[PDB]
């Protein structure tokens, strides 16, 4: 035992969860609201509707101990997603993508939220509709990240047919902030 | 992360998934009964006593779009078990069936349910009493398969202590078929 | 299929189970307590605090088919823990140790419970405050091992925010059970 290697998906970990972020509102009281992901450098922010939906001030937290405020760039009713906007300083961490990586029925998956950090795992239950996972989905990792085992990004943690979960194809998820970044809410 | 592979048991998921079935009920109304699991090339089906108690007419549907009428060849209340019978046309995809493997506490198996299909992963918690596992079994999955790795049958996922799912040992659920097929219901 | 292997944690299993017993209260009945874990040749045993609170008489009974009865050593309110005391004959299973192990989040862990033996599969989802896991944890498990692919003792499983199960890293339950040898109860 001292010299083999345990089984372990801690490399997928050490890779996506610096890019998944806390999420906080700033009322006059501060309440935790959910969880999100960094998508890219310019500093545009994944995260569910529900969570930033009575926001007075919006706060990100990085688990490396940084902490920005957050404007709404805008949201999507439909698919329940939100993207929000803050100032990179020099580096900022962003959630592995592949988009030439095709998700499969059976891929194992970890939930990543941040309610310290929460991770769960699951398979891809159904491939996306949305993604289903058997990942457990709730509050503490709502609106935060699925990555495969590698830690390329493959949905986001959403809420709202019992032990499965949904997460919102990073396909549609890419597409989805890119017309919110361009106009705002979409239709 | 481009160059390689992700952990996936969606091989075992093309082996198996093609061999398990929708069932349902066509009263006078069409209604979703659970699931089911294509044996051999006979045409033979196992499913749940429960999914198939109250059926006017059994409808059978597979996941490459063709839809067969089933008759009962016979039940087991004892093991909720229950054989179906319908034409094989040339090309009837099985559920892949090793007599020789010893299912061991600790392997890891896929429940594979037909209410698009939703699979779930877990281990053999207990080996078959029947056969535990912590995968999610529900009604979505009840009378479905559940395999290793490979994509071997390892039981049918079943119905009637918390977090834990049962499925009848595909040992004894091949010889409580052959039992009903050559007689009909059997004590 | 007939050739290959299944993915499988029955390695681990091998490894680990011999050593996670059951624990009972013989009154004056017969009932069952919990589980727990022997963790060295001397005989002492560790399981949760609540599931001795209660016992006039406590027995234990390892899956090789021995029965000891057992005397407590003493106990931890603050981390719900508890050692007893058995006259080792000559071969004692004990629960796999590496001091050495550095427990990473996304490391694949087995819980395993002595209510027949049930034993579920998750991953470390927060590393210890105490270690949290999303294998399942409950009653028929709570005082039973958690350990790693390699078998390796990682927690001991604990009851007393969804989705998510506890259990006390195994340095923190080496140091406690050692005080409470030298001690008993210690503040």
Do not use: C, W
């Amino acid at each position: 035992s001292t010299d083999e290697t345990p089984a372990s998906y801690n490399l997928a970990v050490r890779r996506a969860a610096p890019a998944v972020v806390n999420v906080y509102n700033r009322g006059l009281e501060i309440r935790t609201l959910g969880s999100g992901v960094i998508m890219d450098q310019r500093g545009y922010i994944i995260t569910n509707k529900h969570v930033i939906n009575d926001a007075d001030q919006i706060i990100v937290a990085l688990q490396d101990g940084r902490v920005f405020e957050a404007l709404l760039v805008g949201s999507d009713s439909l698919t329940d997603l939100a993207v929000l906007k803050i100032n990179a300083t020099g580096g900022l961490p962003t959630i592995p993508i592949n988009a030439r990586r095709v998700p499969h029925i059976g891929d194992v998956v970890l939930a990543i939220g941040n309610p310290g950090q929460v991770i769960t795992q699951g398979i891809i239950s159904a491939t996306g509709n949305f993604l289903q996972t058997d990942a457990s989905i709730n509050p503490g990792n709502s609106g935060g990240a699925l990555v495969n085992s590698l830690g390329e990004l493959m949905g986001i943690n959403t809420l709202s047919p019992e032990g499965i979960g949904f997460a919102i194809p990073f396909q549609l998820a890419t597409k989805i902030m890119d017309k919110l970044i361009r106009d705002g809410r979409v239709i």
